[PDB]
Design a protein around this motif. Structure first.
Motif, mmCIF file in Angstrom:
data_model
loop_
_atom_site.group_PDB
_atom_site.id
_atom_site.type_symbol
_atom_site.label_atom_id
_atom_site.label_comp_id
_atom_site.label_asym_id
_atom_site.label_seq_id
_atom_site.Cartn_x
_atom_site.Cartn_y
_atom_site.Cartn_z
ATOM 1 N N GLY A 167 -35.764 -34.345 66.439
ATOM 2 C CA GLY A 167 -35.350 -35.765 66.550
ATOM 3 C C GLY A 167 -34.487 -35.907 67.560
ATOM 4 N N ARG A 168 -34.085 -37.129 67.635
ATOM 5 C CA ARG A 168 -33.361 -37.680 69.056
ATOM 6 C C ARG A 168 -31.959 -36.827 69.162
ATOM 7 N NH1 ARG A 168 -27.866 -39.275 69.408
ATOM 8 N NH2 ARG A 168 -27.439 -40.329 67.610
ATOM 9 N N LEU A 169 -31.452 -36.606 67.958
ATOM 10 C CA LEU A 169 -29.910 -35.924 67.871
ATOM 11 C C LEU A 169 -30.326 -34.497 68.117
ATOM 12 C CD1 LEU A 169 -27.803 -34.343 66.148
ATOM 13 C CD2 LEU A 169 -27.051 -36.058 67.350
ATOM 14 N N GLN A 170 -31.049 -33.972 67.677
ATOM 15 C CA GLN A 170 -31.394 -32.350 68.057
ATOM 16 C C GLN A 170 -31.646 -32.345 69.351
ATOM 17 O OE1 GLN A 170 -30.210 -32.436 64.344
ATOM 18 N NE2 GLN A 170 -30.814 -30.502 65.243
ATOM 19 N N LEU A 171 -32.493 -33.035 70.128
ATOM 20 C CA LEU A 171 -33.135 -32.855 71.618
ATOM 21 C C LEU A 171 -31.766 -33.198 72.327
ATOM 22 C CD1 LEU A 171 -35.923 -31.972 72.297
ATOM 23 C CD2 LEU A 171 -35.916 -34.231 73.387
ATOM 24 N N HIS A 172 -30.797 -34.146 72.064
ATOM 25 C CA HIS A 172 -29.542 -34.634 72.643
ATOM 26 C C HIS A 172 -28.554 -33.420 72.729
ATOM 27 C CE1 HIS A 172 -29.992 -39.213 72.306
ATOM 28 N NE2 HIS A 172 -30.834 -38.827 73.313
ATOM 29 N N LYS A 188 -28.547 -28.535 84.033
ATOM 30 C CA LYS A 188 -27.119 -28.969 84.769
ATOM 31 C C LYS A 188 -27.094 -30.092 85.438
ATOM 32 C CE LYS A 188 -23.586 -26.968 87.830
ATOM 33 N NZ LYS A 188 -23.201 -25.606 88.635
ATOM 34 N N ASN A 189 -26.493 -30.961 85.003
ATOM 35 C CA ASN A 189 -26.182 -32.569 85.194
ATOM 36 C C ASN A 189 -27.525 -33.248 85.456
ATOM 37 O OD1 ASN A 189 -23.291 -33.732 86.326
ATOM 38 N ND2 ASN A 189 -23.179 -31.688 85.708
ATOM 39 N N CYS A 190 -28.570 -32.800 84.958
ATOM 40 C CA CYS A 190 -29.741 -33.658 84.939
ATOM 41 C C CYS A 190 -29.560 -34.890 83.824
ATOM 42 C CB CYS A 190 -30.965 -32.922 84.377
ATOM 43 S SG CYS A 190 -31.340 -31.362 85.441
ATOM 44 N N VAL A 191 -30.232 -35.656 83.733
ATOM 45 C CA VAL A 191 -30.376 -36.979 82.715
ATOM 46 C C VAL A 191 -31.638 -37.244 82.061
ATOM 47 C CG1 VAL A 191 -29.640 -39.490 82.702
ATOM 48 C CG2 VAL A 191 -28.855 -37.788 84.356
ATOM 49 N N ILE A 192 -31.742 -37.517 80.707
ATOM 50 C CA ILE A 192 -32.777 -37.683 80.135
ATOM 51 C C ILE A 192 -32.847 -39.179 79.413
ATOM 52 C CG2 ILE A 192 -33.431 -35.438 79.942
ATOM 53 C CD1 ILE A 192 -33.444 -35.853 76.744
ATOM 54 N N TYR A 193 -33.954 -39.779 79.072
ATOM 55 C CA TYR A 193 -33.923 -40.979 78.015
ATOM 56 C C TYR A 193 -35.013 -40.442 76.921
ATOM 57 C CZ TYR A 193 -35.184 -45.632 76.400
ATOM 58 O OH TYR A 193 -35.834 -46.644 75.669
ATOM 59 N N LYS A 253 -27.147 -34.247 80.597
ATOM 60 C CA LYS A 253 -26.939 -35.404 79.941
ATOM 61 C C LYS A 253 -27.938 -36.379 79.397
ATOM 62 C CE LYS A 253 -23.959 -39.501 81.138
ATOM 63 N NZ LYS A 253 -22.988 -39.897 82.217
ATOM 64 N N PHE A 254 -27.673 -37.163 78.374
ATOM 65 C CA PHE A 254 -28.976 -37.908 77.890
ATOM 66 C C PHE A 254 -28.215 -39.451 77.993
ATOM 67 C CE2 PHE A 254 -26.544 -38.637 73.874
ATOM 68 C CZ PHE A 254 -25.796 -37.430 73.732
ATOM 69 N N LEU A 255 -29.078 -40.522 77.710
ATOM 70 C CA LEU A 255 -28.711 -41.904 77.260
ATOM 71 C C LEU A 255 -29.653 -42.356 76.322
ATOM 72 C CD1 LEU A 255 -28.749 -43.066 81.152
ATOM 73 C CD2 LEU A 255 -26.913 -42.865 80.089
ATOM 74 N N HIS A 256 -29.141 -43.352 75.496
ATOM 75 C CA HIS A 256 -29.785 -44.264 74.457
ATOM 76 C C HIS A 256 -30.632 -45.372 75.202
ATOM 77 C CE1 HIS A 256 -26.120 -42.192 72.392
ATOM 78 N NE2 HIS A 256 -27.456 -41.886 71.707
ATOM 79 N N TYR A 257 -30.652 -45.629 76.448
ATOM 80 C CA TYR A 257 -31.056 -46.577 77.295
ATOM 81 C C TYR A 257 -31.636 -46.160 78.550
ATOM 82 C CZ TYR A 257 -26.240 -46.475 79.346
ATOM 83 O OH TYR A 257 -25.215 -46.214 80.019
ATOM 84 N N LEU A 258 -32.513 -46.941 79.179
ATOM 85 C CA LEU A 258 -32.728 -46.665 80.682
ATOM 86 C C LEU A 258 -32.814 -47.975 81.596
ATOM 87 C CD1 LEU A 258 -33.889 -44.893 82.952
ATOM 88 C CD2 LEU A 258 -36.065 -45.131 82.053
#
Length: 91
Positions: A20-25, A7-12, A34-39
């Protein structure tokens, strides 16, 4: 039991990851995170998943806390957050 652990956490995503990134996103958004493609915001890192990242490079940046996929997969399985600090790819 399907609780939105992230809940409302963020990853990179860095280095290389599985499945794969899409599956993990998608796992992240299914579980309310939430996720980001950058940091850009190193000063507020929450998690990074990288299944291969040199520990020396990590401490040269001194701003990354890379985690192995076993944490996210097993936190989803338990429907609670686990300490990534025991399923980490840090030094």
């Amino acid at each position: 039991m399907s609780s939105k652990i992230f809940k409302n956490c963020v990853i990179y995503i860095n280095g290389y990851t599985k499945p794969g990134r899409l599956q993990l996103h998608e796992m992240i958004v299914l579980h309310g995170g939430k996720f980001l493609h950058y940091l850009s915001s190193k000063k507020t890192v929450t998690h990074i998943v990288a299944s291969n990242l040199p520990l020396k490079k990590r401490i040269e940046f001194a701003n990354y806390k890379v985690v192995s996929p076993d944490w996210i997969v097993d936190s989803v399985k338990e429907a609670r957050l686990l300490p990534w600090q025991n399923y980490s790819l840090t030094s």
